[PDB]
Amino acid sequence: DSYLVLIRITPDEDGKFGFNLKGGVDQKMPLVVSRINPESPADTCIPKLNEGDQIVLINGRDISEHTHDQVVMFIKASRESHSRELALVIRRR
Protein backbone atom coordinates (compact mmCIF):
# COMPACT_ATOMS: atom_id res chain seq x y z
CA ASP A 1 0.00 0.00 0.00
CA SER A 2 0.98 3.62 -0.26
CA TYR A 3 2.87 5.47 2.47
CA LEU A 4 3.99 9.05 3.10
CA VAL A 5 7.56 10.37 3.33
CA LEU A 6 8.73 13.80 4.53
CA ILE A 7 11.55 15.01 2.25
CA ARG A 8 13.61 18.12 3.04
CA ILE A 9 15.79 19.55 0.27
CA THR A 10 18.10 22.55 0.23
CA PRO A 11 18.70 23.92 -3.29
CA ASP A 12 22.17 24.02 -4.83
CA GLU A 13 24.18 27.13 -5.76
CA ASP A 14 22.08 27.69 -8.91
CA GLY A 15 18.80 27.60 -6.97
CA LYS A 16 17.92 24.15 -8.31
CA PHE A 17 16.60 21.14 -6.39
CA GLY A 18 17.32 18.61 -9.15
CA PHE A 19 14.00 17.05 -10.13
CA ASN A 20 11.33 17.39 -12.81
CA LEU A 21 7.65 17.86 -12.05
CA LYS A 22 4.56 16.88 -13.98
CA GLY A 23 0.96 17.43 -13.00
CA GLY A 24 -1.44 19.89 -11.49
CA VAL A 25 -5.16 20.57 -11.59
CA ASP A 26 -4.89 21.88 -15.16
CA GLN A 27 -2.98 18.75 -16.20
CA LYS A 28 -5.69 16.31 -14.99
CA MET A 29 -3.09 14.43 -12.94
CA PRO A 30 -1.54 14.64 -9.47
CA LEU A 31 1.83 16.25 -8.91
CA VAL A 32 4.38 13.55 -9.84
CA VAL A 33 8.18 13.56 -9.82
CA SER A 34 9.07 12.60 -13.40
CA ARG A 35 12.88 12.68 -13.12
CA ILE A 36 15.64 12.87 -10.51
CA ASN A 37 18.91 14.44 -11.58
CA PRO A 38 21.59 12.04 -10.24
CA GLU A 39 23.69 13.37 -7.35
CA SER A 40 21.55 16.54 -7.13
CA PRO A 41 20.05 17.76 -3.81
CA ALA A 42 16.85 15.77 -4.38
CA ASP A 43 19.00 12.65 -4.98
CA THR A 44 21.31 13.04 -1.97
CA CYS A 45 19.02 14.11 0.87
CA ILE A 46 18.01 11.54 3.50
CA PRO A 47 15.36 10.32 2.85
CA LYS A 48 15.89 10.98 -0.83
CA LEU A 49 13.25 11.95 -3.36
CA ASN A 50 12.31 9.23 -5.88
CA GLU A 51 11.02 9.37 -9.42
CA GLY A 52 7.32 8.54 -9.36
CA ASP A 53 6.74 10.18 -5.98
CA GLN A 54 3.46 12.09 -5.74
CA ILE A 55 3.78 15.45 -3.96
CA VAL A 56 0.92 16.13 -1.53
CA LEU A 57 2.19 18.96 0.74
CA ILE A 58 4.67 21.76 -0.01
CA ASN A 59 6.08 23.62 2.99
CA GLY A 60 2.88 22.89 4.87
CA ARG A 61 0.55 23.86 1.99
CA ASP A 62 -2.07 21.55 0.47
CA ILE A 63 -1.75 21.71 -3.32
CA SER A 64 -4.76 19.59 -4.40
CA GLU A 65 -6.50 22.40 -6.35
CA HIS A 66 -3.42 24.27 -7.65
CA THR A 67 -2.15 24.43 -11.21
CA HIS A 68 1.22 23.23 -12.48
CA ASP A 69 2.51 26.82 -12.67
CA GLN A 70 1.22 27.64 -9.19
CA VAL A 71 2.97 24.60 -7.77
CA VAL A 72 6.21 25.52 -9.52
CA MET A 73 5.87 28.95 -7.93
CA PHE A 74 5.51 27.40 -4.49
CA ILE A 75 8.65 25.31 -4.97
CA LYS A 76 10.79 28.21 -6.14
CA ALA A 77 9.41 30.31 -3.27
CA SER A 78 10.86 27.85 -0.77
CA ARG A 79 14.27 29.18 -1.82
CA GLU A 80 13.47 32.58 -0.31
CA SER A 81 12.76 31.23 3.21
CA HIS A 82 14.53 31.86 6.26
CA SER A 83 16.58 28.63 5.82
CA ARG A 84 15.42 28.35 2.16
CA GLU A 85 14.50 24.65 2.52
CA LEU A 86 11.84 22.80 0.53
CA ALA A 87 9.79 20.43 2.73
CA LEU A 88 7.71 17.97 0.69
CA VAL A 89 5.31 15.35 1.98
CA ILE A 90 5.19 12.77 -0.79
CA ARG A 91 3.24 9.54 -1.31
CA ARG A 92 5.13 6.46 -2.45
CA ARG A 93 4.43 2.74 -3.05
Binding site: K16, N20, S34, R35, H68, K76
Partner: peptide
Protein backbone atom coordinates in the same frame (compact mmCIF):
# COMPACT_ATOMS: atom_id res chain seq x y z
CA UNK B 1 -12.79 13.45 -23.05
CA UNK B 2 -9.54 15.16 -24.16
CA UNK B 3 -5.91 15.51 -23.04
CA UNK B 4 -3.26 17.94 -24.26
CA UNK B 5 0.44 17.15 -24.02
CA UNK B 6 1.46 17.53 -20.40
CA UNK B 7 4.01 20.09 -19.29
CA UNK B 8 7.15 19.07 -17.41
CA UNK B 9 9.22 21.58 -15.45
CA UNK B 10 12.75 21.28 -14.05
CA UNK B 11 13.25 22.76 -10.59
Amino acid sequence: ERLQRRRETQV
